[PDB]
């Protein structure tokens, strides 16, 4: 019963590590255009 | 047309033998859908000996087709 | 039995807040980037 | 021309074996045991498709059936037609 | 660690425990400090049977010089069950971050003595690595080269030891500096990757196909990474396409979208062309346009097949039957597509097939004799494809006979007529209406 709940909670940890892949993405290409403007 | 008619026949016999198997063996299907060709000086046997072996599945039960073309 | 199900959604929630953490990361981007703006300036 | 006249369509479960010769496989099924020994004989690989309603599936099968049959008909004109012409046979035309 | 959730990793680590020996006989063996030697008891007995705490660093100096197969594997579990321990693994993991030879020693033990110590020590140290202070590219560098922990990896009939390695690599892969540690070691750790996805597509099972498919997922998230990735495992990425509609868990075809997304992510170099690449010949298309009409159970599964229907549709879109001939013809590859059958597609391409001094009829009167080359084998493919590349021939010389002169010097001709002596029916079938259209009626 608690393996389910368990598998579940792995399937969050994979889309909380792919979200925080994306935001650290999106992060440094408005850096990097933002700077280039500083630039 | 002689070839697209016949692709578009080929199509719709493919559609029915699934639906008749999906019908016949439930969802999902998981028929062995096969063609084959029997030579023409044994087709009535070829017949007889797939009528045979389709009684398990118990027209008959299983799902057959006679195609001439 | 139904703990599993809670517990299923209460993960999933935890996702979409991390999901929802990524504008943060924009926007601390931009304070970011307005610091080497501000270092820039100082050079000039 | 090809190597049959004829062919034979077969829908049968997997997990069903041949009534004649129970515990036969396929490739025993397509051998002399269930069969006359055909060549060309292979598998269709039909695509999947949305399954729908039982009481869908029934009109869908009778649809296709009346269908086959049309075009069926169709296709045994346009035989009838290009085999009253004596250029079928040949590469005129391009 | 975090690995060691799986089933795989706990009967690993059970086993490692059942081969620990009490750190007291090792003291009186004059194999380790008296003192070292009671504080690593003390720790065992509190963690599985009165913390050391800061005399975890004296314990682990010993079992660095405790030789003995059976003390490391003793110090290996109390570390593993330390680390899993809610009160202990805290302070192991500030001395390691404070002196890195503590992770060097670690590291050191990984990957040796028994497997089942072998995978205790590898988990200890990604447990240190796992901290942001004791994460070191050195040390994620010298864990790659450790030829023992790869051949585990690697070891297919060692199918929990493999797992519980993908495991820990996958929950390693977090870290950037594992992630580029992974992508430098790429070369070695692709094939097993591929070669497990591959027997998956042929529990246990279940758990290292999905710590392969989060580590495929963790490697792709890397724009330049997954295009180097794709080039170098096309034949692996088609095949994980196909395990996608193959695979029946929800999580598992979830993760295989996500990898093909990331590897058709417009961030990805050459992207719109390696998205048609792989919708030309690995029929992505009609997988994507199946899994779309097919239900899962998870709305980021959903949302990842609509994107990558969304892109086939998208490479599809500017796509034409001569260029599916042109594939398959370059794939040396043939089983009667439509284009081969539907005579619209032989007769407007027919003019195409002579351009480039007759390119394409080279092409094929060279894949014909390459067949017959390989027509000793009789196989069924093989026919299939010998009796598609006669038809072909034979519509390419019935359409546009300026041809029969070029295959006649490339000896194509000649080829086909030998080929009248293969046993299979169709062939010779095939092999009499090229003769036929040669000079026959």
């Known amino acids: 019963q608690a393996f389910i709940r368990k598998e579940a909670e792995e399937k969050a940890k994979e889309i909380q590590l792919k979200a925080d892949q994306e935001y650290e993405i999106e992060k440094t290409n408005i850096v990097r255009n933002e700077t280039n403007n500083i630039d | 047309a002689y070839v697209d008619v016949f692709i578009n026949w080929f199509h719709i016999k493919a559609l029915r033998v699934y639906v008749e198997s999906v019908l016949r063996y439930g969802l999902p299907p998981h028929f062995n859908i096969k063609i084959i060709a029997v030579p023409p000086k044994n087709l009535s046997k070829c017949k007889s000996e797939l009528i045979d072996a389709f009684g398990f599945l118990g027209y008959e039960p299983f799902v057959m087709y006679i195609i001439n073309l | 039995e139904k703990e599993a199900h809670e517990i299923v959604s209460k993960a999933r929630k935890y996702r979409q807040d991390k999901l929802k953490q990524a504008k943060t990361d924009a926007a601390k981007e931009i304070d970011s980037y307005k610091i080497q703006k501000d270092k820039e300036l100082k050079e000039f | 021309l090809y190597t049959a006249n004829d062919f034979i369509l077969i829908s049968l479960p997997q997990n069903a074996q041949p009534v004649t010769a129970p515990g036969s496989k396929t490739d025993s099924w397509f051998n002399e045991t269930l069969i006359g020994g055909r060549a060309f004989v292979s598998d269709f690989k039909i695509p999947e498709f949305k399954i729908g309603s039982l009481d869908t599936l029934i009109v869908e099968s009778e649809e296709l059936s009346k269908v086959d049959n049309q075009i069926g008909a169709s296709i045994g004109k346009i035989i009838e037609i290009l085999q009253g012409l004596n250029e079928t046979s040949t590469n005129a035309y391009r | 660690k975090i690995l060691?959730?799986?089933?795989?990793?706990?009967?690993?680590?059970?086993?490692?425990?059942?081969?620990?020996?009490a750190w007291d006989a090792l003291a009186r063996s004059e194999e380790l400090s008296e003192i070292d030697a009671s504080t690593a008891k003390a720790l065992e007995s509190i963690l599985v049977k009165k913390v050391n705490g800061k005399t975890l660093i004296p314990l682990i100096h010993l079992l660095s010089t405790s030789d003995n197969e059976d003390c490391k594997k003793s110090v290996q579990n109390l570390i593993a069950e330390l680390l899993s321990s809610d009160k202990y693994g805290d302070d192991t993991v500030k001395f390691f971050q404070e002196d890195p030879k503590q992770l060097e020693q670690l590291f050191d033990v990984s990957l040796k003595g028994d497997?089942?110590?072998?995978?205790?020590?590898?988990?200890?140290?990604?447990?240190l690595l796992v901290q942001n202070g004791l994460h070191n590219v050195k040390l994620v560098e010298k864990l790659l080269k450790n030829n023992n922990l790869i051949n585990i990896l690697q070891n297919i009939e060692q199918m929990d030891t493999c797992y519980v390695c993908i495991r820990l690599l996958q929950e390693l892969?977090?870290?950037p500096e594992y992630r580029d540690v992974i992508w430098l070691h790429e070369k070695k750790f692709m094939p097993t990757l591929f070669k497990i996805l591959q027997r998956a597509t042929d529990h246990l099972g279940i758990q290292l196909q999905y710590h392969s498919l989060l580590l495929i997922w963790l490697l792709t998230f890397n724009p330049v990474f997954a295009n180097e990735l794709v080039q170098k495992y096309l034949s692996d990425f088609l095949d994980l396409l196909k395990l996608v509609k193959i695979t029946i868990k929800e999580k598992v075809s979830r993760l295989c979208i996500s990898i093909i997304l990331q590897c058709c992510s417009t961030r990805v170099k050459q992207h719109k062309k390696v998205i048609?690449?792989?919708?030309?010949?690995?029929?992505?298309?009609?997988?994507?346009?199946?899994?779309?009409?097919?239900?899962?159970?998870?709305?980021?599964?959903?949302?990842?097949?609509?994107?990558l229907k969304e892109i086939l549709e998208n490479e599809y879109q500017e796509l034409t039957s001569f260029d599916e001939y042109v594939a398959e013809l370059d794939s040396k590859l043939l089983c009667w597509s439509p284009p081969h059958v539907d005579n619209g597609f032989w007769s407007d391409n027919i003019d195409e097939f002579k351009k480039d001094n007759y390119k394409i009829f080279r092409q094929l009167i060279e894949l014909l004799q390459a067949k017959v080359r390989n027509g000793d084998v009789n196989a069924k493919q093989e026919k299939i494809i010998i009796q598609v590349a006669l038809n072909d021939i034979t519509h390419v010389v019935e359409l546009l006979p300026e041809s029969i002169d070029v295959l006649d010097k490339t000896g194509g001709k000649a080829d086909i007529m030998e080929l009248l002596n293969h046993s299979d029916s169709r062939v010779k079938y095939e092999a009499l209406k090229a003769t036929q259209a040669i000079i026959g009626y």
Do not use: C, W
């Open chain 5, 4 to 21: 060691m959730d799986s089933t795989h990793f706990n009967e690993i680590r059970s086993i490692i425990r059942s081969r620990s020996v």
């Open chain 5, 115 to 127: 497997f089942q110590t072998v995978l205790i020590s590898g988990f200890n140290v990604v447990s």
């Open chain 5, 173 to 175: 892969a977090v870290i």
């Open chain 5, 276 to 307: 048609k690449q792989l919708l030309l010949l690995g029929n992505a298309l009609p997988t994507v346009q199946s899994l779309s009409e097919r239900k899962y159970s998870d709305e980021e599964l959903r949302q990842d097949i609509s994107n």
